[PDB]
Amino acid sequence: VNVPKTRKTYCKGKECRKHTQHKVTQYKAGKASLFAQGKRRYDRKQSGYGGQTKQIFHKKAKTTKKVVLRLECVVCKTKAQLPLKRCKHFELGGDKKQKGQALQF
Amino acid sequence: MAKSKNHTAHNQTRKAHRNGIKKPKTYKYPSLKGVDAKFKRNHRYALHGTAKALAKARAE
Amino acid sequence: ARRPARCYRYCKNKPYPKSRYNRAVPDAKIRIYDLGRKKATVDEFPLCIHLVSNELEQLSSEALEAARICANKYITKVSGRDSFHLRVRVHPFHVLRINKMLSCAGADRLQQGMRGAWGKPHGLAARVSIGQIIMSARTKDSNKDVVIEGLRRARYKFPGQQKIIISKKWGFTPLNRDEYIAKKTNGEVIDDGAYVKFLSRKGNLEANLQQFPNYQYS
Amino acid sequence: GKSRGYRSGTRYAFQRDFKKHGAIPLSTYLKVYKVGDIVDIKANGSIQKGMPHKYYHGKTGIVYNVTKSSVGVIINKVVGNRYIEKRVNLRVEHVKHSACRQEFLNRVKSNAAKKREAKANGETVYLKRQAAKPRGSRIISTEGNIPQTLAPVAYETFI
RNA sequence: GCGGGGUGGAGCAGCCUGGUAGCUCGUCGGGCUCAUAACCCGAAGGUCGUCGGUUCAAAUCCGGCCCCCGCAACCA
RNA sequence: UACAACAUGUU
RNA sequence: GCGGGGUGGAGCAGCCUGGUAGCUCGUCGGGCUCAUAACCCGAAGGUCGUCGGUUCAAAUCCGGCCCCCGCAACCA
RNA sequence: GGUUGCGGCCAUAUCUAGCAGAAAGCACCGUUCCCCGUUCGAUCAACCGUAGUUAAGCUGCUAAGAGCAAUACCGAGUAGUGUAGUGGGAGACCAUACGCGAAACUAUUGUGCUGCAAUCU
RNA sequence: CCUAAGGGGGACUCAUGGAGAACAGAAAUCUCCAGUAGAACAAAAGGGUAAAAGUCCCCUUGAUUUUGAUUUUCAGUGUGAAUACAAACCAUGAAAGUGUGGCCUAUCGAUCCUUUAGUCCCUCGGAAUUUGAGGCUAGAGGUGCCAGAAAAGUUACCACAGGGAUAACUGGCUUGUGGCAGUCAAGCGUUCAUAGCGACAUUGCUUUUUGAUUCUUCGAUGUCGGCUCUUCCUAUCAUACCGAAGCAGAAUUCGGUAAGCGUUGGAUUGUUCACCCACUAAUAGGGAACGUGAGCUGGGUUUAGACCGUCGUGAGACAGGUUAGUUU
RNA sequence: AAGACCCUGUUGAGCUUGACUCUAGUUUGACAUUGUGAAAAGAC
RNA sequence: UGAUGGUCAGAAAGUGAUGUUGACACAAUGUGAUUUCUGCCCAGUGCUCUGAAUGUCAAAGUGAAGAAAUUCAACCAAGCGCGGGUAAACGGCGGGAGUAACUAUGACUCUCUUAAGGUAGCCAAAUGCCUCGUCAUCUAAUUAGUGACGCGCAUGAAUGGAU
RNA sequence: GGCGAAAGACUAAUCGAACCAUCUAGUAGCUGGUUCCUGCCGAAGUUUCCCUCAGGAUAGCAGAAGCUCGUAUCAGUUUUAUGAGGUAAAGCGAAUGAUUAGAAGUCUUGGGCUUAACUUAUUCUCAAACUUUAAAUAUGUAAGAAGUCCUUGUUGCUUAAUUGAACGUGGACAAUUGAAUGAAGAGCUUUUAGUGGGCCAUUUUUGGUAAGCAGAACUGGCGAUGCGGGAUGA
RNA sequence: CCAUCGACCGAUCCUGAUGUGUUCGGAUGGAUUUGAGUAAGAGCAUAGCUGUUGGGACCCGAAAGAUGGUGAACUAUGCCUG
Ligand SMILES: CN[C@@H]1[C@@H](O)[C@@H](O[C@@H]2[C@@H](O)[C@H](O[C@H]3O[C@H]([C@@H](C)O)[C@@H](O)[C@H](O)[C@H]3N)[C@@H](N)C[C@H]2N)OC[C@]1(C)O
Ligand SMILES: CN[C@@H]1[C@@H](O)[C@@H](O[C@@H]2[C@@H](O)[C@H](O[C@H]3O[C@H]([C@@H](C)O)[C@@H](O)[C@H](O)[C@H]3N)[C@@H](N)C[C@H]2N)OC[C@]1(C)O
Numbered sequence A: 001v002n003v004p005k006t007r008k009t010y011c012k013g014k015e016c017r018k019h020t021q022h023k024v025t026q027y028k029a030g031k032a033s034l035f036a037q038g039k040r041r042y043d044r045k046q047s048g049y050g051g052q053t054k055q056i057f058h059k060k061a062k063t064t065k066k067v068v069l070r071l072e073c074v075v076c077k078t079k080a081q082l083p084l085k086r087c088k089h090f091e092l093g094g095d096k097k098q099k100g101q102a103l104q105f
Numbered sequence B: 001m002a003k004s005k006n007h008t009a010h011n012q013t014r015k016a017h018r019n020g021i022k023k024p025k026t027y028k029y030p031s032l033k034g035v036d037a038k039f040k041r042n043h044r045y046a047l048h049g050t051a052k053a054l055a056k057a058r059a060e
Numbered sequence C: 001a002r003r004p005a006r007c008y009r010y011c012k013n014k015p016y017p018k019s020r021y022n023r024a025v026p027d028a029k030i031r032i033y034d035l036g037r038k039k040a041t042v043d044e045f046p047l048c049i050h051l052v053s054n055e056l057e058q059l060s061s062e063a064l065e066a067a068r069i070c071a072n073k074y075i076t077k078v079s080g081r082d083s084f085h086l087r088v089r090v091h092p093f094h095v096l097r098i099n100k101m102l103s104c105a106g107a108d109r110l111q112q113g114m115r116g117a118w119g120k121p122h123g124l125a126a127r128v129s130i131g132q133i134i135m136s137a138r139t140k141d142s143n144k145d146v147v148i149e150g151l152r153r154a155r156y157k158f159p160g161q162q163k164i165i166i167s168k169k170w171g172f173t174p175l176n177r178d179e180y181i182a183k184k185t186n187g188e189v190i191d192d193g194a195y196v197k198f199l200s201r202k203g204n205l206e207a208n209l210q211q212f213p214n215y216q217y218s
Numbered sequence D: 001g002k003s004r005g006y007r008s009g010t011r012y013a014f015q016r017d018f019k020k021h022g023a024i025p026l027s028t029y030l031k032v033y034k035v036g037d038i039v040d041i042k043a044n045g046s047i048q049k050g051m052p053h054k055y056y057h058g059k060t061g062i063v064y065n066v067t068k069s070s071v072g073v074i075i076n077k078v079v080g081n082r083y084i085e086k087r088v089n090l091r092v093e094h095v096k097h098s099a100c101r102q103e104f105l106n107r108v109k110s111n112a113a114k115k116r117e118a119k120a121n122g123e124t125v126y127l128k129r130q131a132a133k134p135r136g137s138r139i140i141s142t143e144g145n146i147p148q149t150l151a152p153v154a155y156e157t158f159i
Numbered sequence E, G: 001g002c003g004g005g006g007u008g009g010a011g012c013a014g015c016c017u018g019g020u021a022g023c024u025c026g027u028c029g030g031g032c033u034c035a036u037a038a039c040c041c042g043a044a045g046g047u048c049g050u051c052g053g054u055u056c057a058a059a060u061c062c063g064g065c066c067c068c069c070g071c072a073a074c075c076a
Numbered sequence F: 001u002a003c004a005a006c007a008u009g010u011u
Numbered sequence H: 001g002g003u004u005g006c007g008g009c010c011a012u013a014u015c016u017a018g019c020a021g022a023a024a025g026c027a028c029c030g031u032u033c034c035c036c037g038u039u040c041g042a043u044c045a046a047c048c049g050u051a052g053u054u055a056a057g058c059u060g061c062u063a064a065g066a067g068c069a070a071u072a073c074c075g076a077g078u079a080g081u082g083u084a085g086u087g088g089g090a091g092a093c094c095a096u097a098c099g100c101g102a103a104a105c106u107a108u109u110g111u112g113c114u115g116c117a118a119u120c121u
Numbered sequence I: 001c002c003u004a005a006g007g008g009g010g011a012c013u014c015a016u017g018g019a020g021a022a023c024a025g026a027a028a029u030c031u032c033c034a035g036u037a038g039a040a041c042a043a044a045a046g047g048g049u050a051a052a053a054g055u056c057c058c059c060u061u062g063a064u065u066u067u068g069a070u071u072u073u074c075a076g077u078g079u080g081a082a083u084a085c086a087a088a089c090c091a092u093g094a095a096a097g098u099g100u101g102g103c104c105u106a107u108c109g110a111u112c113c114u115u116u117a118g119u120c121c122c123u124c125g126g127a128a129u130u131u132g133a134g135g136c137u138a139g140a141g142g143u144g145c146c147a148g149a150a151a152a153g154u155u156a157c158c159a160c161a162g163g164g165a166u167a168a169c170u171g172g173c174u175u176g177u178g179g180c181a182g183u184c185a186a187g188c189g190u191u192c193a194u195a196g197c198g199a200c201a202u203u204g205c206u207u208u209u210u211g212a213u214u215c216u217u218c219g220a221u222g223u224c225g226g227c228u229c230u231u232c233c234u235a236u237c238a239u240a241c242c243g244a245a246g247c248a249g250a251a252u253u254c255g256g257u258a259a260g261c262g263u264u265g266g267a268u269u270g271u272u273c274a275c276c277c278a279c280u281a282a283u284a285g286g287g288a289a290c291g292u293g294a295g296c297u298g299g300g301u302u303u304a305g306a307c308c309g310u311c312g313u314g315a316g317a318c319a320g321g322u323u324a325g326u327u328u
Numbered sequence J: 001a002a003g004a005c006c007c008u009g010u011u012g013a014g015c016u017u018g019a020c021u022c023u024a025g026u027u028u029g030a031c032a033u034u035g036u037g038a039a040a041a042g043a044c
Numbered sequence K: 001u002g003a004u005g006g007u008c009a010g011a012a013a014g015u016g017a018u019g020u021u022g023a024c025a026c027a028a029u030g031u032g033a034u035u036u037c038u039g040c041c042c043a044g045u046g047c048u049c050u051g052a053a054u055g056u057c058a059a060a061g062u063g064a065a066g067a068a069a070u071u072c073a074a075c076c077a078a079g080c081g082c083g084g085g086u087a088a089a090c091g092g093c094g095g096g097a098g099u100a101a102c103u104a105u106g107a108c109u110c111u112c113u114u115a116a117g118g119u120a121g122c123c124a125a126a127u128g129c130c131u132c133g134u135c136a137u138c139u140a141a142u143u144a145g146u147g148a149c150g151c152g153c154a155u156g157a158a159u160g161g162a163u
Numbered sequence L: 001g002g003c004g005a006a007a008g009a010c011u012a013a014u015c016g017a018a019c020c021a022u023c024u025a026g027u028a029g030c031u032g033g034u035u036c037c038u039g040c041c042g043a044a045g046u047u048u049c050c051c052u053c054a055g056g057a058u059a060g061c062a063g064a065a066g067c068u069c070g071u072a073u074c075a076g077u078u079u080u081a082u083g084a085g086g087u088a089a090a091g092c093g094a095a096u097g098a099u100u101a102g103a104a105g106u107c108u109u110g111g112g113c114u115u116a117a118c119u120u121a122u123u124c125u126c127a128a129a130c131u132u133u134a135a136a137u138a139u140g141u142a143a144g145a146a147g148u149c150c151u152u153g154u155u156g157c158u159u160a161a162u163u164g165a166a167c168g169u170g171g172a173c174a175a176u177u178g179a180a181u182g183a184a185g186a187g188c189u190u191u192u193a194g195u196g197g198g199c200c201a202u203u204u205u206u207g208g209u210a211a212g213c214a215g216a217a218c219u220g221g222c223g224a225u226g227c228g229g230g231a232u233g234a
Numbered sequence M: 001c002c003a004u005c006g007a008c009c010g011a012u013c014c015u016g017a018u019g020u021g022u023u024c025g026g027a028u029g030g031a032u033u034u035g036a037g038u039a040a041g042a043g044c045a046u047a048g049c050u051g052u053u054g055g056g057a058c059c060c061g062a063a064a065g066a067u068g069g070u071g072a073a074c075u076a077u078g079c080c081u082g
């Protein structure tokens, strides 16, 4: 999958509410905070005696992740997220396909 | 050891005909759900105007 | 190695031919279907005698091979190869299957029984109706009894019941003897090797008239 | 394993008729559908958009909604011990007017005409349809038609 | 219950997929030598274990009669 | 540094 | 029910990851020796078991078949 | 009635081989400054209707024509099939009773019908 | 898997074959003709498509935003997938139109937790400010046992609740396999198909083999063989009488009526079986809950002790071998 | 004698281990117990 | 294992066993009289040793930023990793081709490969499936016994070999 | 825990973890039992989900209570009209695939007068995953009052429009209100039981040599049912 | 009581007047959205049958697990005295 670095789409920002130019990047999840309630609850449950107090997932089955596109409007800087289908190889702004060329291995 | 019957429709129509098979009931005015929104929007205003015109005509 | 033929006698299954869906199918034991003087002219062998099935069953290719050899050998031995034309009129297109259960002691330990019991190709058989022709032999009228005896011997090679019928028709043609003679005297038949061609009053007039110069338009 | 996809078992039902492939004749797109019309559903395999499910192939229903390129048809489907009202959106390539309805409207018109005729003429006309009655009596002449005797024929073989 | 295997005097090809039998070891003639051994060149040599069938035609496809190596071969 | 062997039988 | 292999004459790589078939021994030519062996300078030789498919392109990926080697076949 | 433009149904309209076509229309046909498109004014674009032609397109006619379509004391009430019996037959199967009912084959016939608008020896 | 292989427009026609053109040949490129698709359309198969859905060219991002209705699976719940509209915003084209991913039918994922986007809106409850935290709407991180526990073995020391819903005997159904009998007649038999045989085929019978099945029995029908004893079957080994011969005699072979009467002694093996020795008129085959354990025996099998080999890190395993093991 | 073989049960137990989750012990560091001096390398 | 010790006990203790002890001892294992012998392998799993040399590495501590909660960084114990030893530790101890003047066999050669490729012995053995192996002996006759043979499914050296 | 010249042995007839009391009426999707009569109605072994497969939940089938009405419009049926289908049969000198035999041409296409390919007209035989054709049975819809006709009202939808669309006002058609037969009446609601092992027969049908075998379809049965008959028998 | 088109209240999306602690306020008019709402109340209390959940939970039934105690008169092993 090859996706261009720019994409003209609808912007929900109240200044636009129309198709504007967006700059496309790949979404990457932020780091897990040590002070989120769920993590503060987990640490308290794990302290003391009793061993592992929650389930740890083991039976991995998927080999891909859905790629999320981060679309930032070039006007108002509003962000939009867009998920794609599962793919093993993803790149942004790769060289476009050209057919009718003698392949030159 | 636990092999048993997989599937059958035996006796199923007999059960269905004890209290069925009932036709659905019809009404003079159908629900306008699923009807085109633009038509439904204007049909509201047409019925409203008819009521006013008939009320006025009944008044005089 | 062959099960007795009673295990595959009757047409219990839908036809199962060699195709894209069962490739590894062994060949039939019968290869030759036309025996004797197959290059003979239609006029040479007027008498036609049929061995007709009286059963709705499956005839193995081994049975067809045995019957062919028996009838051919007897008629050739008594009246020579040139006295007849014998044709097998059924082809074994049905594939038989076998489950291959081990026949030793202790087999219950190894084999799986009726689990996954779909069989492997086992042999070939022809499916025949009641009243279907199994073998046809055209010959001269003077060789009638020898051909009947040849077909009588070949009958014992088949399961079930079969009849030997003398046909009213001329050789392998679809015309009675009198109809074939009437067509012949009007110049509406020509030899096409072992068979003939008939006049059609439809189509290109000039081509038809060239094809049958002896035709007597009436 | 088993396969129960959306168009499973439609190998022949959705094929086009023999030597009837290709473009849709424009009379299909010129018919006019109104709410309350009775239409027959027939999937056209060349139009993949707005298709019926295989269940509704060959069923007949009432039009309840009219959109740009399609109609909504009401079908009654048996589910267990009762019918369920089903609502299907069908592009007009998969729909056709039902002929029995036009015949019934013909009968309504004719019946009103006859009743008006009888009214203005001073008599009464019976307007219910009737099933075929037993025939009445009749006398058959033998002029040129002397009864001819037939007998069962003997068995013969034509082999 | 039986896979399989029987081809020159011997070890092997040729089959599968019918139309045509090759090589090696050895035998006999010559070359070479003073004469040999070796080596080189030539040549003879199997109707395909036996019989019957299918076929226009069988070493070849099918089945019998001989020989052989091997394997399957109650139970509780 | 490395260097193994020379068919049989005579006159 | 299976898992591994088939590549110059021999034994082995390259396969994992499609674009040039590599190593040791062996064979052939010439040299060195009276000749041999060793040694020295040069050359040939496998379409990757077969039948197909996929691909721009197959030894390489997939399917069927042939030959080889072994694993497993338990509770009564 | 011919012809053209736009059609409906979509071979009775298609295909092969010959012949004929008055008028009008359609067509082939001439040219390249201009809008335009090509390796190529061949197609496509424009211009002239002027110089030529019914050769081709198109239309109609012909053929024991191919295909297609339709009909039937054609095959055949045959194949098949719904219902029934303490029917027949070892069985495969078969007959009967009350009903429905093919396809191939055989023979004969036919070869576009038509809507709107304009136009014509 | 695809930034096109998505969306729109345009132009063109594919597989294949024939006849031609230097190198050039069967396959290089050009030309014409035929060509209903015999091509192509990512990937299975089926459907669909020809002035196109195929090929090439030009422009694009509708693979977008907001939530509703509907179809399939269906409980008419969820998930996946799909259909037709409404309100926007865009693309393309002269335009009518078409476009809410891939021509259609598969290509996928809850609660809790984390993370990101959005209003930067709500809350931190004595009142504020700023950090931090918690909420509301929409996605992502994943459960393939795919409506979604966090999970290695062994037991031959064993336990319990049950099961004839289920295996290990007998019995029943079946009869492939085992055993036995027919039909035909290519050949063998010095000639002669059938004295005696009998290929290729083909019809049966039996339940003395072994399977297949799982109907009965798991609040138990004592589970090998031998010994002992009775009886039954006949598909007859001997004995009685006879028919046939490729019956000179002798011997032998084929067949009939026949189960009245008999069918042994031993070496090795737990053995059934097998294999030899010997006698004999002959040393036929079978059944009776694979006859027969409150009749025995206990060699084997099949508890617990022990040894070996291979396997396993190990506990241990082994229709592998070995020795000892209460018979009411 | 509510089969001890076999199977089932979201019934156990004895034993084993590179199963999951822990644990006595043991070892390693910091701080406290913990005070009084000197020399030499470092840092404000 | 030389006592500030090894092995073991206890909830703890100013607590114990060995110990009225001291390497000719105590503690922990394996093999199993004598005779004759105990081959090769430290790659794996363990056990052990070195750290002057160092990647990773907890709490405390150190530095920087910040209003602070906090964040980030550097330094950093044992361990891990790296390197050496060890089989009377657990254990292990190979394939494929060609080759001698009848044939057959293969002393001999090539090649693949291992940590090493089963040595001395022994054997159808309580260990060999095939298998009632083959030969000999024992008997009238022997799936028994014994002696031989050995590409040994799967014999073999203190998991002790042969006597 | 002990003790063990080691058998998981022994530790008071108890040992692969003693005995005693208590937690404790421990839990059991499993086995057994579950106590008077008559009357009326009366099943299910099927759907979906579940570490679900000897169990639950869910729908279905059943009972009870009724409630709103009183012939409205209903039916496991026919008739008339009008659709859909690709199974039986059929076909292959019709497409795809399979397949026997000659004949006539082309040698330009390959071994040696012609074995073979190729083309043309013929010829024998086939298909669950082939097909032009194509039943019987089964199957969708309609047969009016919520209908038809005339005139003209509403609307922000639609049309070039006074065009339409939908819903209406007013007027016309009245028991043949627009086929048959039947109708212990129609419609509506709540709530809850058991069940969720099935099995048999005709026909269709899959695996299997077959089976009192295993698995589907429609119907009728047995289960849950006695009675007359088949001697006996779900 | 039923079918249907509206109207009112809360949530969601849009619009955005007079005015202002100039960032608040939110008039007004819209939206195939959404609620266990409104639209001349129907509830509370006691009792009964049936159904549900927790409890010994219709009755009897494990193999197990835990807490605190009693045994070396049998037997195992060491020691002392015969
Ligand atoms: C040793 N060299 C030999 C050379 O001698 C020759 O060998 C032939 C050999 O081929 C012949 O061999 C042939 O002989 C005839 C053939 C000629 O038709 C056949 O009948 C025979 O079956 C076949 N073996 C044999 N008969 C004689 C040798 N010298 O050719 C072969 C060769 C290897 O080059
Ligand atoms: C400036 N005046 C504004 C007015 O414009 C309007 O603003 C809305 C605002 O209400 C919405 O805001 C909404 O945001 C979330 C949402 C989950 O409902 C809620 O937390 C919040 O209460 C709600 N009002 C916002 N999403 C869009 C603005 N235009 O409503 C709020 C307001 C204060 O009256």
Ligand SMILES: CN[C@@H]1[C@@H](O)[C@@H](O[C@@H]2[C@@H](O)[C@H](O[C@H]3O[C@H]([C@@H](C)O)[C@@H](O)[C@H](O)[C@H]3N)[C@@H](N)C[C@H]2N)OC[C@]1(C)O
Pocket: I283
């Ligand atoms: C008394 N000793 C006998 C000894 O005579 C002999 O007996 C056989 C016997 O076993 C045979 O029987 C054996 O063999 C026949 C086969 C030949 O048909 C089999 O059918 C049968 O089942 C089998 N038991 C029998 N036919 C003859 C006796 N002499 O062998 C067995 C024995 C025990 O050694």
Ligand SMILES: CN[C@@H]1[C@@H](O)[C@@H](O[C@@H]2[C@@H](O)[C@H](O[C@H]3O[C@H]([C@@H](C)O)[C@@H](O)[C@H](O)[C@H]3N)[C@@H](N)C[C@H]2N)OC[C@]1(C)O
Pocket: H081, H084, L202, L203
């Ligand atoms: C025309 N097709 C027929 C079809 O009609 C039907 O035929 C049945 C036939 O099978 C019935 O017969 C069947 O049932 C009877 C009995 C139990 O009723 C049995 O005796 C008989 O063996 C059995 N074949 C017969 N009684 C009526 C026909 N219509 O089934 C057989 C068939 C060939 O398909």
Ligand SMILES: CN[C@@H]1[C@@H](O)[C@@H](O[C@@H]2[C@@H](O)[C@H](O[C@H]3O[C@H]([C@@H](C)O)[C@@H](O)[C@H](O)[C@H]3N)[C@@H](N)C[C@H]2N)OC[C@]1(C)O
Pocket: M031, M037
């Ligand atoms: C804002 N657009 C509205 C549209 O939302 C709708 O209004 C609904 C209305 O129909 C709902 O009302 C619906 O549901 C209620 C029930 C929930 O109480 C019923 O009482 C009522 O009969 C029913 N129509 C009402 N609950 C909310 C409005 N926004 O009515 C049409 C509309 C004017 O276009």
Ligand SMILES: CN[C@@H]1[C@@H](O)[C@@H](O[C@@H]2[C@@H](O)[C@H](O[C@H]3O[C@H]([C@@H](C)O)[C@@H](O)[C@H](O)[C@H]3N)[C@@H](N)C[C@H]2N)OC[C@]1(C)O
Pocket: M039
């Ligand atoms: C007499 N005036 C009535 C007034 O009383 C009221 O009537 C309600 C009626 O609207 C309700 O009905 C309403 O809400 C029900 C509900 C089930 O959703 C629905 O049928 C639908 O939304 C709506 N018709 C009905 N259930 C009760 C009457 N009293 O509603 C307004 C009204 C119709 O004008």
Ligand SMILES: [Zn+2]
Pocket: A011, A012, A013, A015, A016, A017, A020, A073, A074, A075, A076, A077, A078
């Ligand atoms: Zn923006």
